[PDB]
Each structure stands twice: as structure tokens, then as C-alpha cells.
Amino acid sequence: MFDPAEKYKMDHRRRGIALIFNHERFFWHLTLPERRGTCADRDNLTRRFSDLGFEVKCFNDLKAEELLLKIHEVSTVSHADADCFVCVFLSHGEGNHIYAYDAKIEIQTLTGLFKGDKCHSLVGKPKIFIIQAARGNQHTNITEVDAASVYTLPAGADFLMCYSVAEGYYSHRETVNGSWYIQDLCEMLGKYGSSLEFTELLTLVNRKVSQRRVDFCKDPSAIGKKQVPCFASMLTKKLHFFPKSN
Amino acid sequence: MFDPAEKYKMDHRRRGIALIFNHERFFWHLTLPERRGTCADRDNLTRRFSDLGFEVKCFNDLKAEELLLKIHEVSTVSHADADCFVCVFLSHGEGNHIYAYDAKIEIQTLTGLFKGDKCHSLVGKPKIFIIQAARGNQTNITEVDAASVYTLPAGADFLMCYSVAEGYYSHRETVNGSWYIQDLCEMLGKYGSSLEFTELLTLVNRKVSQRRVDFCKDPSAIGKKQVPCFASMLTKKLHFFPKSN
Numbered sequence: 001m002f003d004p005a006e007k008y009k010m011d012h013r014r015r016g017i018a019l020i021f022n023h024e025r026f027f028w029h030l031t032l033p034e035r036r037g038t039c040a041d042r043d044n045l046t047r048r049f050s051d052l053g054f055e056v057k058c059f060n061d062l063k064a065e066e067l068l069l070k071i072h073e074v075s076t077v078s079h080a081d082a083d084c085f086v087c088v089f090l091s092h093g094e095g096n097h098i099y100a101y102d103a104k105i106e107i108q109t110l111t112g113l114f115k116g117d118k119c120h121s122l123v124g125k126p127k128i129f130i131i132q133a134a135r136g137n138q139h140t141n142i143t144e145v146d147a148a149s150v151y152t153l154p155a156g157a158d159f160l161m162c163y164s165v166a167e168g169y170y171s172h173r174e175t176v177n178g179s180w181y182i183q184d185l186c187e188m189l190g191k192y193g194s195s196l197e198f199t200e201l202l203t204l205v206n207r208k209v210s211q212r213r214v215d216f217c218k219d220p221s222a223i224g225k226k227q228v229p230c231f232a233s234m235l236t237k238k239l240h241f242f243p244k245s246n
Numbered sequence: 247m248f249d250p251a252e253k254y255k256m257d258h259r260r261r262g263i264a265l266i267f268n269h270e271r272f273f274w275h276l277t278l279p280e281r282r283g284t285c286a287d288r289d290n291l292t293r294r295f296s297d298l299g300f301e302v303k304c305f306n307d308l309k310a311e312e313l314l315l316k317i318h319e320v321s322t323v324s325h326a327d328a329d330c331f332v333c334v335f336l337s338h339g340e341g342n343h344i345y346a347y348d349a350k351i352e353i354q355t356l357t358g359l360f361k362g363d364k365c366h367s368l369v370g371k372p373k374i375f376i377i378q379a380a381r382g383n384q385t386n387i388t389e390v391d392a393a394s395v396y397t398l399p400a401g402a403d404f405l406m407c408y409s410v411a412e413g414y415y416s417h418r419e420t421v422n423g424s425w426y427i428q429d430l431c432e433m434l435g436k437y438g439s440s441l442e443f444t445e446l447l448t449l450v451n452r453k454v455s456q457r458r459v460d461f462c463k464d465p466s467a468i469g470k471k472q473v474p475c476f477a478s479m480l481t482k483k484l485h486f487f488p489k490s491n
């Protein structure tokens with residue numbers, strides 16, 4: 001019966017939702033810097049995920065309450081007619097927390113809402129989280145550099161957690177072109193999104209970002225600050241985004 | 247000439263070393279239970295990794311000093327003539343720590359010794375860590391430990407492999423061994439030499455997640471699912487194709 005080349009079933013009526021929470025500015029009294037370039041990330045993702053059949057829904061600078069309502073809404077709607085779910089965080093983070101406009105939120109409580117315990121329509125279907133989060137500095141196209149801060153957390157069965165940067169390393173954001181991670185993710189989605197198995201592609205993104213040179217830098221102190229992204233797979237089958245037949 | 251199907255070069259003279267640190271018993275004053283079945287894990291791994299061309303080196307119940315010496319030795323030998331490196335921990339853990347016989351060791355300092363910085367012969371070559379570690383509870387019974395060890399990343403070209411994720415539970419049959427390792431070794435047996443290693447680890451995720459936990463000998467072991475994960479920092483496809491002599 002058992003089959004090593006078994007794929008997630010990706011022939012439902014709709015591909016499914018892509019949430020994109022995009023944070024540029026923060027409440028004054030948090031003392032976190034503007035993330036100039038995050039809009040390039042939001043837009044580049046919105047395009048690439050649209051071309052793969054996702055209903056993309058972006059949300060700019062939500063407060064904790066607004067964000068929790070929007071994500072809980074999406075959790076309690078039926079995904080019965082959908083292949084999978086994608087959720088993206090473009091913000092600052094620390095440890096097991098992502099920053100909303102006004103406060104930090106436990107990543108576990110966000111992934112928790114799709115555990116299959118709480119969201120039956122997504123049991124056995126891929127739940128991909130993509131996280132571009134790091135430590136706010138707190139000092140035309142400049143390259144800004146943040147220290148890795150967000151833990152490479154796992155989640156539950158059939159989750160894929162995707163991280164801009166690993167412990168020890170550094171996250172880069174061009175203020176016009178956007179995050180190195182997202183640039184290379186979106187480029188690879190453009191070329192291979194609809195052909196390649198998704199973790200094969202994420203592996204390409206690891207190569208592309210690791211191979212970015214950091215020896216001759218505008219800023220002297222940005223030198224030797226490599227970026228290595230990772231992903232934590234709890235997936236149980238091959239994942240493809242083959243064109244849905246229209 | 248950038249290539250989406252690019253593989254790690256796996257045609258060096260030797261496959262490379264597999265370290266297996268195997269912990270069954272602990273210093274009394276740590277109050278950690280015997281891990282009855284860990285020998286089945288050690289042996290099953292030793293066999294499967296040997297068949298793939300690894301020079302397997304097992305070490306039973308080392309103290310912190312002995313372990314750090316053995317792993318530092320392996321880090322400072324030349325791996326120039328080798329495809330890759332494998333390191334396996336069968337013990338208890340907590341957070342970012344693995345338990346030696348006498349004390350806990352920071353996992354980061356163990357993976358640290360193979361970072362491109364400190365081990366030139368392994369730059370660009372896969373460094374796989376496999377970790378069967380969880381919280382000491384306190385004929386063939388199934389014992390159940392709560393997940394405790396963080397699913398830590400490492401550096402470029404590392405693959406960190408974990409028995410269990412946060413929230414879930416690790417299982418060990420006291421004769422047959424850990425659920426994780428049983429299914430890992432079975433999949434290595436069938437597909438080790440054909441399939442890309444992360445494809446296989448994905449099969450292991452399916453096999454372990456699908457193990458039923460509804461009708462259990464022990465009432466309180468019911469509804470305690472096991473979901474393993476892996477954190478890939480790999481940059482290329484990884485295969486263990488048979489080496490020709």
C-alpha cells in the first residue's frame with residue numbers, strides 16, 4: 001500500500017488563502033525602527049502567491065487585537081474546498097514572538113489555530129508559515145542588517161515553518177528591493193514555483209541567500225555578517241503547486 | 247549556469263564518519279531514568295549507516311569531558327576525502343542541552359565544531375545531526391517522554407533531525423527502541439541509497455505521525471501523538487548512492 005513518492009492532494013476547487021501581515025512602523029513606546037523595504041516584500045510575495053492560485057489577503061500595521069481577529073476568522077472559515085494555507089509575517093521578532101504594531105504575540109498561539117485539533121478543514125493539508133523577523137537596530141537603496149532573533153520553531157503535523165535567518169546569522173533588507181530572503185524566495189517562486197517540490201525550492205533559496213557575498217560592503221561593520229535561512233518540515237508528503245486547470 | 251537539481255558531490259574516496267553517542271544510564275545525583283531500548287536504536291542505526299558506507303563509531307555512556315574530547319578529535323581530523331558527516335545523540339535533553347552521563351552540554355557548542363569557520367575539510371559538505379532526546383519521566387513496554395529539546399537550527403549545509411516537536415511526545419519500546427529511530431532505520435533500509443535524504447525524513451514524519459495512540463496498554467499514554475521534524479540549512483539535494491568499491 002505505502003508509497004515513497006506520495007504527494008499532498010492539490011486538486012481541490014481553490015488553492016487556498018495566503019495571509020500576509022506586513023509591519024513597517026510600530027507604536028512609538030516600543031522603540032523599534034521602521035522596516036523600509038517591507039512593502040517590496042509584501043508586493044513581491046502578493047504577486048508570486050497570486051500566480052500560484054492563492055487568494056492573497058494583505059494587512060498593513062495591524063494592532064494585536066485586529067491581527068488575532070483576522071487570523072482567528074481565517075482559522076474558523078471552512079478550508080474544505082482548498083489545497084493548503086499560507087501565512088506570512090514581515091515584522092520584528094524576539095524568541096517565540098512576532099511584533100504587531102502595539103505588542104508582541106506568541107507564534108505558538110498563531111500556528112495553534114490551524115493544529116487540526118482546532119481546524120478540521122485543514123487536517124492532512126499543508127500549513128506553510130513564512131517568517132521574515134529579526135531584532136530592531138534601535139539607533140537611496142541602503143542595505144540594513146538585523147541580528148537573527150526569532151527561534152526556528154516547529155509546529156504540528158503537516159506544518160512547514162520557513163525562516164529568513166538561523167541563530168548566529170544576520171538578516172539583510174535593501175530599503176527599496178526588500179529582504180534578501182524574500183527577494184530570493186520570490187525569484188525562485190517565479191522560475192520554479194509551479195514545477196518544483198516546495199522544500200526543493202526552499203533549499204535553492206538557502207543556496208542563493210548563503211552565497212550572497214558580505215566581504216566588500218558600503219558599511220564597514222556589515223562585513224562578515226552571513227545570512228543562512230532554514231525551514232522546519234513537519235510535512236508528511238511531497239508538496240507541489242502545479243497549475244490548477246482553468 | 248545555476249541549476250535547480252544540483253546535488254552535493256558524493257563521490258569522495260570515503261562516505262565519512264557517523265558518531266553515535268548512546269546514553270542508557272546517568273550519574274545517580276541527576277535523577278534521570280534508564281533509557282531501556284536505546285541499545286536497539288544504537289545497533290539499528292550502526293547497521294543502516296554502515297550499509298551506506300559510513301565509518302560508524304559508537305560511544306556508550308561517556309562523561310561530558312570524554313564526549314567533548316571524542317567530538318573535538320573528529321572535528322580536527324581532515325574530512326577532505328569524505329562526502330559528509332553524521333552525529334547522533336541518544337540521551338535525555340532539555341532546551342538547547344543534551345545529557346552526557348554526568349552533565350548537560352550546549353548543543354550549539356557540539357554543532358559549532360563543524361561550522362565552516364572551525365572545520366575547513368567539511369565546508370560545502372552536508373553535516374547531519376540526529377537527536378533522540380526528551381525529558382526523563384521519573385517484557386517490551388512502550389515508555390513515553392514529553393518533547394523537551396528545541397528544534398535548533400545550525401549553520402550552512404547542516405541538517406538537524408529531531409525525534410519529536412514542541413507540544414508532542416517521544417515513544418521508546420524497551421526492546422524494539424524509539425519510534426523515531428525504528429521508522430528512520432526502516433526507511434534507511436528500504437530507500438537510504440535511492441531517495442534524497444529529506445524526502446526520506448518526510449516519509450519518517452508520515453510513518454511516526456500515523457502511529458496510533460487511541461487503544462494503549464497504559465490509560466494515560468492515550469492521545470499523546472508523536473510528530474518529528476527536521477531543520478534543513480542544506481543548499482543542494484543529498485543522496486547516499488552506493489559507492490563503487
Ligand SMILES: Oc1cc(F)ccc1CNc1ncccc1-c1nnc[nH]1
Nearest residue numbers: 148149150151152153166167396397398
Ligand atoms: O533558533 C534560534 C534562532 C535565534 F535567533 C536565536 C536562538 C535560537 C535557538 N532557540 C530555539 N530554537 C528553536 C526552538 C526553540 C528555541 C528556544 N530557545 N530558547 C527558548 N526556546
